[PDB]
Amino acid sequence: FVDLETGTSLYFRDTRDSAEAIAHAADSKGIKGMDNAIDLYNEYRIVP
Amino acid sequence: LRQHASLIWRVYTAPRPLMTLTNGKCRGTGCGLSLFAKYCALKDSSEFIFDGPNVGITPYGGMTRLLARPETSLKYPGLAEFVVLTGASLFAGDALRLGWTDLFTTIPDMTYHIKEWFDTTEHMHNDAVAWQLGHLLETCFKMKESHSSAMERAAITPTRARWVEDAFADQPSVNDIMRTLTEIEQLPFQSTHN
Amino acid sequence: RLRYEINEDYKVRDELGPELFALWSKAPERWPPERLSKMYGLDFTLVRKILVWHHFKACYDACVEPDWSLPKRLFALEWIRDVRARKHGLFYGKMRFAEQKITFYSDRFLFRDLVNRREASYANVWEMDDPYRFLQTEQDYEDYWGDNYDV
Amino acid sequence: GGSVLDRSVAVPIGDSTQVRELFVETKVLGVEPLQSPPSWRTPFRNDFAEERLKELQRAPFKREKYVSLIQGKYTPKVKKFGYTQHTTVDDFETKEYKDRLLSKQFFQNPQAFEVVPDRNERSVQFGGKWEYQRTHGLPTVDRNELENGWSEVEPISDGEMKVIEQALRDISGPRPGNFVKPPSKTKSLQLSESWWEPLGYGWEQHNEEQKALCDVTEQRLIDGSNLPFGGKLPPFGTSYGMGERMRAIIEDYSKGFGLGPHGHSPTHDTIHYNTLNAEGERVRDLGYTDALGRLFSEKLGDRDVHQWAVESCADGEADVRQLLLSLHEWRERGRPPSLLLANVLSKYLEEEIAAFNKGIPENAPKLQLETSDGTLAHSGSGGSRS
Amino acid sequence: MEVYRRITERVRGALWAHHGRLMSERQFHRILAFVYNNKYEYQIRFDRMEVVGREWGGRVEVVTTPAGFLKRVRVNPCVEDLTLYQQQQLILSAYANACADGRKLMEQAEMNIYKQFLKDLKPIVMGIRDNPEFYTVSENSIETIGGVLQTGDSNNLCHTHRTIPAAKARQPADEVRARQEWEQKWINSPRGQSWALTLRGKTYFALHGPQYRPRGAPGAKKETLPLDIPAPYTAMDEKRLLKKNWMAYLDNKHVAEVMWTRVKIADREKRQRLLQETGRAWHRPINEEAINRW
Amino acid sequence: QNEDKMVVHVLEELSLRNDGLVMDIQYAIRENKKNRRLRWEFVTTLLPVFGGNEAKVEQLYSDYCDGKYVPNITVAVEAFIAFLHNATQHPETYSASDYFDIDDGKSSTASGTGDQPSAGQYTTLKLLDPLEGPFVFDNVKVEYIQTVERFRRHGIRAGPVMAPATGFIAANCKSLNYFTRRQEEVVYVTNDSDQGLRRSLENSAYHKTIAANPALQYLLKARRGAALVETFNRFFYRTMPMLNFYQNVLKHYSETIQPLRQAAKSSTRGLARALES
Amino acid sequence: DDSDILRLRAPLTYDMDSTAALHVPTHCGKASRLAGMLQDAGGVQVLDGLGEVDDKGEPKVPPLQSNASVPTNVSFYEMARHPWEDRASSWRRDGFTEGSLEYFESQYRSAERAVYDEEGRGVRNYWPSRDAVEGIAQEEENDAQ
Amino acid sequence: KVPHSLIYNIYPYLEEIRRRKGMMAMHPPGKDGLLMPDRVVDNRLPDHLKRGYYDDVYWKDFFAGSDEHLNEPRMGLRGDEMRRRLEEAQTSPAPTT
Amino acid sequence: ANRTITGNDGRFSKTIMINEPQCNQALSAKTASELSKEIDKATNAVYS
Amino acid sequence: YHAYVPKGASVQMGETFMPSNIATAVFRETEAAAARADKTKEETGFFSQPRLNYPVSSGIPALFSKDQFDMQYSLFHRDVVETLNRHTLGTPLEGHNLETVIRKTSFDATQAVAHTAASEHFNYCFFYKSLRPWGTAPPPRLREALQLQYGTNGSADAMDEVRRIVWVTAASHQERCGWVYLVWSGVHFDVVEFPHGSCPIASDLIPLLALNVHESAYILDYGTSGLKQYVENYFKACNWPLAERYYLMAIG
């Protein structure tokens, strides 16, 4: 998934509105939460 | 009013990826709910109608910020005033021109295909889900091919854009707008400006 | 024969020196385990084990009595879970996977607790991260403090 | 001091006559409460008579030279980061903290403070079996000094922040040798592993470089016939796993990264780079031949480069070593010449430049040797400098 | 956090790409942990203080903390004559004003935190950019097997910059020691004693006087030269990993490469969005000759 | 002549002799040309005094930038006086870019000169900030900014805050630029040996208007006898740093050329002997 | 009338239309928990004439003031310095013992002075003699003795 | 459906969500964390300047035998250092040629 | 409860449909509150 | 953003202020360019323009100016390619490579309309292929091979003789419309003047160098009388190694 370039845009999708990104009005800057790497070691293991 | 505002804000700030598949006409609150989502997909049937003043009230929903974006005022001067006053409808093509949404799908029953794709996918890591979403967007929503600028549903064709920029842009008065419209009325059909 | 080992990023040679040891030794109240665990990029159990080891190493170096209740305070949920598992299943020890209840919840089951966590507000930060927030009733207090007789 | 909670301790001033004869003018401001001075500012709580006595006694030893007991010990001994014995900073270690720590350590291990220790076992404890609940932990300093008492941080101006952001966006730029690592650059892989030494991965390019650049008198020639695999990757079903492992490691080391001319990752799902050696044939049909380099070579001919250098530079007009280094770096290696070399070539090759630029159309690029710019790379000159 | 993590990942990727050096994962996460603890201490300081919000002139007053913890509510008796919904909305608006004030203070303090973090990260960037072997190429330049070609693109307008002087041995340590010599000369100057006896000298010695701090007092006991860690000349983790085991070295190299590729993609997409906002880029791909012709 | 050298000849010889210094000088020249603040300051200061067309002002600015123009001391003092007269009348345009350290009346001291400097009037002339000031390399720019900010905040009168003595063409001389072999042509304005700044401002037609300003009397007092001299040097270094820059370049070249010549001669002779052997 | 437009553009106040201001994020967050937060605080304190102003202009029952201000002395990087050196950098510099470093530097300087200028003339030479290269430093023998 | 025995993996996520209150939720008001390389910088220096660049701050001949750092790997080396490499390379195939 | 918000959940993707054809998909106060609850529940679901 | 920006427009890293009127104008120009690209994407044919290895954001150094080279590349060659596609799509020549198209259309009066277009296509492709932006020095092997025939008892005489004879045979083409090909017929090198619509492969030769003697090639920078200077510039910015490798492959 990381080797294939597609899909990396979703991390920085918040850059769609530059003014909004600068203002930081919304805390949902992450793909799966507040920030992109909110939890990379415990959250992904919920699936069996 | 508070509940509609809160719903719009929640859709706007939803943490996990939310995609509003807009298929149909939208009023002020509907367009505020659709456009401000993190992911917004527009089909050929998309219709964003503010239509505030004709009902006797100011337009409500948050689309005024999108109309007043410097990008919008730069690409189509006077478009914000034209939409807020005349209550015109902005289409999927118009939103694509204005850069509000990057997703435009022509595939029927997209919801079933999305359900099947995300049932077939099996993982939960952030990079894996990001790749899956990106591949879906690229192969179904991103207009890489099989899309013509003539085949998109738009109402801001360049002649109409010039009309709007000549009749609404940089006119800080409704009375001045009315005077300009009245002056344009008496343009003969032989006039080059007409 | 013992050449290669897993997790080469965090070596025990680097772990021998406690992180911000003096700074958190001056005041133990201001340093809940979350602050120290923010240093590492491993799972929760691994980082808590590392924190316990670092505290014990610091105490041994300073030649003072180490806090034997620190592992209990770091694994307070785990300690209560083990105590109640030993109460339910007539066994003594540490519960394992093969002796755990089988139940399937909906993937959105956590919403009720999630809204509480997301809309919780605290006066100070020590109230937010107090180590006894896991105990609510006298049964919880008994299950937690039933180990030592003094309390 | 430099802190709100870093006031001094009360000090005595003389009587009314003393203060009148001392002060010349006093301005009284608003009334504020009295705050006790911190522990470090307090004199009797920060006295270090014993420590000063010990360090003064040990000072005369510090007047001699450092020696090693083992004759010939040269390499230093590293001290690890964060170890207890290597820490010297004392944030709140005043005399009260020192004596509290000393008391705790003594009541823990009284044997450690004896010149000749006795047997050390563990006896009963007066606080039950859980006396650690009351005896554990290092001595604790007061929270008021922990929180309010700290040095005032220097206010960082926005100018330095802008400078740091500019540095970040400068380092954000790409290095050309990352998207496609050159085969010469893909030879720097050596492993401490035993199996890696017997077989040479980059022997082909290594001997190619040796026989293309190094003279036959001194060069490294390696014949692959003696290698275990014959210098080539064995077939898929006749490797015993060694071929597969080596191929995987080589591909992993040689894979590129970053963004290419199309602005996508080299292993992008949809698009590709260098299809059917398109870039290979482009490089074949373009090459690396500088116009100034070929003009200089054709004018010099076959005569001695050192003779050319000594005739070009007068007795004290230009240095010889610098000129030779610049000429070698410019001709043998693909690097732009320095301004010294540019001036030398402008003075020595003016006829060639005039011939090249005599019939030039006005809009078309020319070949000029100018150094009004402060940089040497031809990227800033658009490739017209050289 | 998010922005700090992005900055640190960009730093690691640039450090690996430009100079071929590998930063330890522990060192990577240590900076983020320091930022988190700095924010934690700021929150510790902020919870002590208090903010006031006012609604309906002075009819409704709400006393809270900058974080947004309800502490006190004062309400004029006339407000109780209103229905419950109106009272709830008035209290909510007053709390919103209090939250706005707390947000202003917290964002100012967090800008302070960001400046501190950039100051702390300065030595790494300066050591990876201020060495005699460091160069970049314009993004619009064609890259091939051998080297990068250079398109015109108004090459007269284009100007290559240099951040290092050709003069021998120019360093931040030299600059700082020059500053120290200058301040010592000012102190020893005849006006120096008068200025030191003046209140300005007292404040200067109190703030930038680390050598005068008594033993056992918080803070540094001396002013030290800034960090000098040049990437191409200092071995960080790559040699240790290669000596210990090759698999970990390959894994860390892969992580660094992926982070560098990710930050490059982020920069590319930000540039694309800027172009689309300006109006020079169409909303859908129209020029496939720049993608499919390779 | 080799001894009597113009700056262009110095640069072209240094290009063949030592690459680093000439390369750094050229890079600094290019950066100063790119900078827009310096041009604005130069034209703003030299418009009222010269009283000439903007095209001539721009050409003279370019000549001074590349080093083929140095203003005379007479026009320099006239420019300083005219700038003071222009600033004391309408400060808005001058307060926008030029800065005078405004004294705070809250601060008080047990000294007459301190009380006068604390009256709320002008006390010192503020130099340009390092962001758009004279060129400094980015490797030391951040610490330079930190040092200058600390010095200006704590009132330390040392380091970059102090303006180096600037050189100007003497009244008798007619040459428009410096020379290596010419030294009496450039004269520094020293506190003990003033070149007539006070004598010029006293007979200037704007002396009454300047004295009417209730802020400049502290500077005009010259309590140490060097207030006007120091503000003159500060103003001219803030406006034309290139003069001091070129003076430093000339001094360095003059002091270092001979060892380079000796080293080049020795190396050439060694290589020639090795070749002829 | 333009006065109506001016009053519309005027900021929302409860006196004019008895409608509280809207804050969308806090309404999303704490609307359903406002009663709980108030009960946790202890209820609403009713004070007579809280917002009313006396005819002289003095605001009887004076309002409370906010004591909050941005902290000025925290600098966590300065709080957590290097172990031995007092530098506040976050980097993990693995230093060497001071005595070993001093001996290392002294011996290196002696070796360099013996190699590059064996004659003592003070001029560096790039073709050192074999004896001057492989000669064991006599300073080590003197130190051992 | 999520197994009962695996929902302990979400606990760090919930803990961080609950502890994101206050200052932890703040972001730099003005910086989005993405910086574009607007300008191109180069620090490459010619070999003669490279030899003497680090005379003072570092030891003399800092770039002595570095192949990648120097255009000429053997520039600035001494006789013994050159002779070691040349002797090794020439005595490896001693009887061959 | 009023059968105005409908939901179809797969293994990982959740689709929420508004069904108000009598009022041209117009939302009331209660309907909007329920829709917001469903949106912030489905978005905050673990396997969403 | 490479796929989004149009071919004509460029990406500028530097940021400068833009007036609203010019920003709206450039947005409208971008929209018009997108519409034009959509229009042209459906009329594309079997044969397309070759990719240029060297950058042409500026004029080719020492040989051409930016505007003149852009004209030569995007007007006459584009028209030739369009005519070739139009007249080959219907005919049975469709779906076959340029080599066999030229070979089967050569010496056919009826199909001369397609033959001339194909020949001009190949000639323009080879002319673009054989132009180093700054020029190449002749390789020693090729110069030795040319010394046998063109060289006359002189050092470096062969290259001067070739540069003279190419200009001689170019000026011998008074029509000012055609090509000059240095080719290897199979026995020896020779220079051939190819009129408009004549191809070396159609004549069964192995080309080495191609020179455009069209009036439109030098009408702008060199006028109608700068033919000699244009030839000198072509030889000072030519590309010899391609001819070297083609001749070596011919030899075997």
mmCIF file of C-alpha atoms in Angstrom, chain G:
data_model
loop_
_atom_site.group_PDB
_atom_site.id
_atom_site.type_symbol
_atom_site.label_atom_id
_atom_site.label_comp_id
_atom_site.label_asym_id
_atom_site.label_seq_id
_atom_site.Cartn_x
_atom_site.Cartn_y
_atom_site.Cartn_z
ATOM 1 C CA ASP G 1 -35.070 52.024 4.814
ATOM 2 C CA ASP G 2 -31.312 51.870 5.327
ATOM 3 C CA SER G 3 -31.732 52.084 9.111
ATOM 4 C CA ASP G 4 -33.267 48.605 9.061
ATOM 5 C CA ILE G 5 -30.264 47.289 7.117
ATOM 6 C CA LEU G 6 -27.902 48.956 9.591
ATOM 7 C CA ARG G 7 -29.710 47.338 12.521
ATOM 8 C CA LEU G 8 -29.609 43.971 10.735
ATOM 9 C CA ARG G 9 -25.846 44.290 10.258
ATOM 10 C CA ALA G 10 -25.469 45.363 13.891
ATOM 11 C CA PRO G 11 -24.201 42.531 16.127
ATOM 12 C CA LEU G 12 -26.743 40.245 17.758
ATOM 13 C CA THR G 13 -27.867 41.359 21.220
ATOM 14 C CA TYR G 14 -30.442 39.827 23.539
ATOM 15 C CA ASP G 15 -32.133 43.177 24.204
ATOM 16 C CA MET G 16 -33.199 43.695 20.585
ATOM 17 C CA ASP G 17 -34.743 40.314 19.741
ATOM 18 C CA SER G 18 -34.295 38.077 22.830
ATOM 19 C CA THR G 19 -32.156 35.549 20.954
ATOM 20 C CA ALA G 20 -28.832 34.220 22.200
ATOM 21 C CA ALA G 21 -25.788 34.162 19.944
ATOM 22 C CA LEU G 22 -24.960 30.938 18.105
ATOM 23 C CA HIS G 23 -21.620 29.130 18.417
ATOM 24 C CA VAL G 24 -21.832 26.045 16.217
ATOM 25 C CA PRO G 25 -18.941 23.924 17.599
ATOM 26 C CA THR G 26 -19.816 24.445 21.264
ATOM 27 C CA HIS G 27 -23.467 23.751 20.448
ATOM 28 C CA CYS G 28 -22.377 20.499 18.814
ATOM 29 C CA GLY G 29 -20.249 19.672 21.845
ATOM 30 C CA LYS G 30 -21.871 20.684 25.123
ATOM 31 C CA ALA G 31 -25.543 21.329 24.289
ATOM 32 C CA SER G 32 -26.673 17.896 25.499
ATOM 33 C CA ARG G 33 -24.433 18.125 28.593
ATOM 34 C CA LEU G 34 -24.970 21.732 29.718
ATOM 35 C CA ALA G 35 -27.309 20.663 32.522
ATOM 36 C CA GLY G 36 -24.820 18.039 33.671
ATOM 37 C CA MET G 37 -21.955 20.533 33.699
ATOM 38 C CA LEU G 38 -24.070 23.066 35.608
ATOM 39 C CA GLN G 39 -25.061 20.442 38.184
ATOM 40 C CA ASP G 40 -21.406 19.442 38.535
ATOM 41 C CA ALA G 41 -20.450 23.090 39.062
ATOM 42 C CA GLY G 42 -23.148 23.458 41.711
ATOM 43 C CA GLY G 43 -25.955 25.371 40.027
ATOM 44 C CA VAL G 44 -26.564 28.928 38.885
ATOM 45 C CA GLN G 45 -25.857 31.660 41.436
ATOM 46 C CA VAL G 46 -28.565 34.340 41.345
ATOM 47 C CA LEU G 47 -27.281 37.783 42.342
ATOM 48 C CA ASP G 48 -29.623 40.768 42.330
ATOM 49 C CA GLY G 49 -28.674 43.482 39.854
ATOM 50 C CA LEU G 50 -25.776 41.568 38.317
ATOM 51 C CA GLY G 51 -25.882 43.393 34.986
ATOM 52 C CA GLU G 52 -27.798 46.521 35.936
ATOM 53 C CA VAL G 53 -25.899 49.814 36.084
ATOM 54 C CA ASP G 54 -26.511 52.545 38.644
ATOM 55 C CA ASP G 55 -27.688 55.970 37.506
ATOM 56 C CA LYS G 56 -24.284 57.413 38.438
ATOM 57 C CA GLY G 57 -22.675 54.830 36.131
ATOM 58 C CA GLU G 58 -21.085 52.630 38.800
ATOM 59 C CA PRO G 59 -21.838 48.966 37.979
ATOM 60 C CA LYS G 60 -23.276 47.772 41.295
ATOM 61 C CA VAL G 61 -22.467 44.127 42.002
ATOM 62 C CA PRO G 62 -19.192 44.512 40.069
ATOM 63 C CA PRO G 63 -18.393 41.729 37.599
ATOM 64 C CA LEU G 64 -15.541 39.316 38.125
ATOM 65 C CA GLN G 65 -12.370 39.688 36.072
ATOM 66 C CA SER G 66 -10.222 37.115 34.297
ATOM 67 C CA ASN G 67 -6.722 36.634 35.714
ATOM 68 C CA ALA G 68 -5.513 34.493 32.803
ATOM 69 C CA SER G 69 -2.353 35.399 30.896
ATOM 70 C CA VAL G 70 0.046 33.595 28.577
ATOM 71 C CA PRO G 71 2.792 31.869 30.615
ATOM 72 C CA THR G 72 6.203 33.483 30.220
ATOM 73 C CA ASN G 73 8.618 31.027 31.914
ATOM 74 C CA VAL G 74 8.088 27.393 30.929
ATOM 75 C CA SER G 75 10.611 26.453 28.209
ATOM 76 C CA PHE G 76 10.358 22.687 28.604
ATOM 77 C CA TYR G 77 13.419 22.291 26.380
ATOM 78 C CA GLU G 78 15.316 24.292 29.001
ATOM 79 C CA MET G 79 13.695 22.204 31.746
ATOM 80 C CA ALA G 80 15.001 18.993 30.121
ATOM 81 C CA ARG G 81 18.649 19.608 29.208
ATOM 82 C CA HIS G 82 21.527 17.299 28.343
ATOM 83 C CA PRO G 83 22.769 15.113 31.233
ATOM 84 C CA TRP G 84 26.334 16.417 31.554
ATOM 85 C CA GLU G 85 26.396 19.563 29.421
ATOM 86 C CA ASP G 86 23.731 22.173 30.141
ATOM 87 C CA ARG G 87 22.624 22.528 26.512
ATOM 88 C CA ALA G 88 18.841 22.473 26.115
ATOM 89 C CA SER G 89 18.903 20.620 22.783
ATOM 90 C CA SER G 90 16.712 17.563 22.262
ATOM 91 C CA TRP G 91 19.485 15.647 20.481
ATOM 92 C CA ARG G 92 20.970 12.528 22.084
ATOM 93 C CA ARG G 93 24.677 13.299 21.810
ATOM 94 C CA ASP G 94 26.740 10.372 23.119
ATOM 95 C CA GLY G 95 29.701 12.148 24.673
ATOM 96 C CA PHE G 96 33.051 10.829 25.843
ATOM 97 C CA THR G 97 34.719 11.092 29.236
ATOM 98 C CA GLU G 98 36.582 14.366 29.674
ATOM 99 C CA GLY G 99 39.896 12.879 30.800
ATOM 100 C CA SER G 100 39.973 10.362 27.962
ATOM 101 C CA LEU G 101 39.129 13.142 25.503
ATOM 102 C CA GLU G 102 41.940 15.324 26.863
ATOM 103 C CA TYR G 103 44.479 12.505 26.584
ATOM 104 C CA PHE G 104 43.181 11.673 23.096
ATOM 105 C CA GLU G 105 43.543 15.268 21.898
ATOM 106 C CA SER G 106 46.998 15.703 23.447
ATOM 107 C CA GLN G 107 48.303 12.490 21.886
ATOM 108 C CA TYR G 108 46.766 13.362 18.510
ATOM 109 C CA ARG G 109 48.394 16.800 18.563
ATOM 110 C CA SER G 110 51.743 15.234 19.457
ATOM 111 C CA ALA G 111 51.412 12.699 16.630
ATOM 112 C CA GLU G 112 50.460 15.365 14.081
ATOM 113 C CA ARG G 113 53.324 17.632 15.159
ATOM 114 C CA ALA G 114 55.716 14.687 14.868
ATOM 115 C CA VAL G 115 54.455 13.619 11.431
ATOM 116 C CA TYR G 116 53.815 16.803 9.468
ATOM 117 C CA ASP G 117 56.834 18.741 10.811
ATOM 118 C CA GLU G 118 59.477 16.271 11.971
ATOM 119 C CA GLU G 119 62.309 18.761 11.394
ATOM 120 C CA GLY G 120 60.524 21.363 13.523
ATOM 121 C CA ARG G 121 60.733 24.051 10.829
ATOM 122 C CA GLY G 122 56.978 24.632 11.144
ATOM 123 C CA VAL G 123 56.175 23.855 7.488
ATOM 124 C CA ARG G 124 53.849 20.974 6.660
ATOM 125 C CA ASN G 125 55.335 18.207 4.511
ATOM 126 C CA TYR G 126 53.293 15.738 2.454
ATOM 127 C CA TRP G 127 56.103 13.159 2.058
ATOM 128 C CA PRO G 128 57.000 12.203 5.638
ATOM 129 C CA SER G 129 59.863 9.818 6.265
ATOM 130 C CA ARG G 130 59.213 6.235 7.331
ATOM 131 C CA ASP G 131 60.971 6.748 10.665
ATOM 132 C CA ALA G 132 58.905 9.865 11.399
ATOM 133 C CA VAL G 133 55.707 8.025 10.430
ATOM 134 C CA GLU G 134 56.187 4.725 12.275
ATOM 135 C CA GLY G 135 58.110 6.158 15.235
ATOM 136 C CA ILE G 136 56.404 5.402 18.534
ATOM 137 C CA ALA G 137 55.734 8.598 20.467
ATOM 138 C CA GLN G 138 58.390 9.114 23.135
ATOM 139 C CA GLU G 139 55.926 11.147 25.213
ATOM 140 C CA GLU G 140 54.045 7.923 25.967
ATOM 141 C CA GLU G 141 57.241 6.297 27.253
ATOM 142 C CA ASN G 142 58.073 9.374 29.332
ATOM 143 C CA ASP G 143 54.558 9.378 30.803
ATOM 144 C CA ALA G 144 54.772 5.667 31.643
ATOM 145 C CA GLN G 145 58.150 6.185 33.317
#
